[PDB]
Amino acid sequence: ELATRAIPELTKLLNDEDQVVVNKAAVMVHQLSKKEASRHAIMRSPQMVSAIVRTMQNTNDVETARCTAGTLHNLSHHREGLLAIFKSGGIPALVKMLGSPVDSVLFYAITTLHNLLLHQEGAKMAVRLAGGLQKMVALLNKTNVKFLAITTDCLQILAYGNQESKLIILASGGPQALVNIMRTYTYEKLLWTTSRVLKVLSVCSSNKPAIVEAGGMQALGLHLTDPSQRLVQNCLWTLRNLSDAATKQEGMEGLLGTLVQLLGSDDINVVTCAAGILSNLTCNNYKNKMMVCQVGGIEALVRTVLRAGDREDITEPAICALRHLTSRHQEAEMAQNAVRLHYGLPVVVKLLHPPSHWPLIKATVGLIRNLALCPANHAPLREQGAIPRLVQLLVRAHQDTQVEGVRMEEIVEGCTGALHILARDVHNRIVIRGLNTIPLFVQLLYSPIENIQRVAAGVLCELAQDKEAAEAIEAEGATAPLTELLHSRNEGVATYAAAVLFRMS
C-alpha cells in the first residue's frame, strides 16, 4: 500500500501543471510526513523527494512552499531522510529559499540546512558550492534571536577548518554583523554560538584586524561577567587570539579593568586566559600600562604568580605582564616599588630556581632587570639570593654559545643586564665579585653582539670603582678588547669601554 499507488499518484499530482492540484497534493504529503509509517515511505521514494524539492523552488503559493519546506524539515530528523534530501538536490534548493520573505519558509529552510550540516557528510561542500555562506551572513540582520542562533551555528560548522569559508565570511562583511550581535542581544545561546564563530575567525593573523576595528574587543568584554561559563570561556579565547594583533587599538580601558578582576576567579583556566590577554595588551602600550596600574594590576598579578606555583602556563604571561608594566611609562617607578610592597620579590627570585623552563626564566630575568632600576629593590633582591642564580644562569647560557625556543644569547644579555644594574649598590658588588664573575665578564667583551658588549663593559665599569677589582680586570687581559671597543660606533659600548680603562688607573 502507499508505495504501490498513493505515493506514485501523489508524486504525479505534485508535479502537475494545475497549481490547485499541486497545492492539494502538497498538503497531503505534508500530513503524511508527520507519522513514522508514512514518513518512512516518503524518504524511500526518491521520486517523491525530488517532486517536493522542485515544487518548493518553483511554486508561487505560500501555503505550498510552507508545506513542501515543512515536509523536507520532517524528513531531516533521521539518517535516511537526510540522505534522501541530499541526493535529491535539496541543499541548493534550501539555500535558494533563504531569500524567502515568508518566515515559516525561511525557518524551515535554515533548520533543515542545519540538520544537514550536523549529521549529513558532504553537506559542508554542497552548502559552500551553492553560495550558502553569503546568504547566511546577509541574514544576520534579522531580529529573531532563535533564528540567529541557528544561522550562526551553520557558519561555525562551515568555517571550522576551512579557509575558503572563513575568507567568504570576512569578504561578505561577517565580522561587523557578528560583533553587532554580541553588542546588542542577550540570548545566551546566540551569544555563545556567535563567540564560537568569532573564535574561528580570530585564529589567523591577517583575519584578526577586521574583528578588532569593528569594536570586537569591547563587544566580547561585555560578556566576561555573564553567568554562562562556556560563553565567558569562548570570549576569553577569542580575546587572547585578537590581543597580540590589537595592541594599538584605542579604548581598551573598561576591558582591562574587567580582566584584572577576572584574576580573582576560582576558575584556573579563566585566570590563565586573563593573564595572557593582559600580557599582550600591555606590550608597548603606555596607555594600557597606565590603566592596569590604576586598578591594582600589580597586586593582582603578583597574587596570580603566587597562586600558580610551578604552573608555567600561568606564571609566564603574568611575569611577562609584570615586565611590561615595570618599564617605559609615567608610573614605571610606581610599578617597580609596588612589586616589592606587595611581596613579589621572593616568588620572582624563586622562579629562577628549578624546575622553571627557559621561556619563564627569560621573562623573569627581564622583570628583575626592571625591578633593579628601583634603588629600594637592591637590598631585598640581594637578601633573597638573586645574584648567585643570575650568575649561575649566565654561566649556563655562556656554555651553550661560547633551546626551547629561547636564544641563549638573550639570556646572556639579560642576566648581565640585571647584574649591571644591581652593581649600582656597594654591597651588591661585593657579592658579584665573590663568585669569580670578572673572568666571565671579560670574555663577554669579545662577543659579536653589541648589546652584550655594552652590558659586559657596563658591569665591569661598575665593578671597577673598587680599586682591587680594577686590577683583577686588568690582570685578566681586558685592556686589549676594551681598547678595541673604544672605536665602536655604538656610543654606549665606547662610553663604558672608556670608563673601565679610566678606572683601571
Binding site: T111, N115, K146, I150, D153, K189
Partner: peptide, 13 residues
Amino acid sequence: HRCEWAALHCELV
C-alpha cells in the same frame, strides 16, 4: 547541550 538544537528547532518552526 546534546539534543539542544532540536528543542530550539522545534520552538522556532
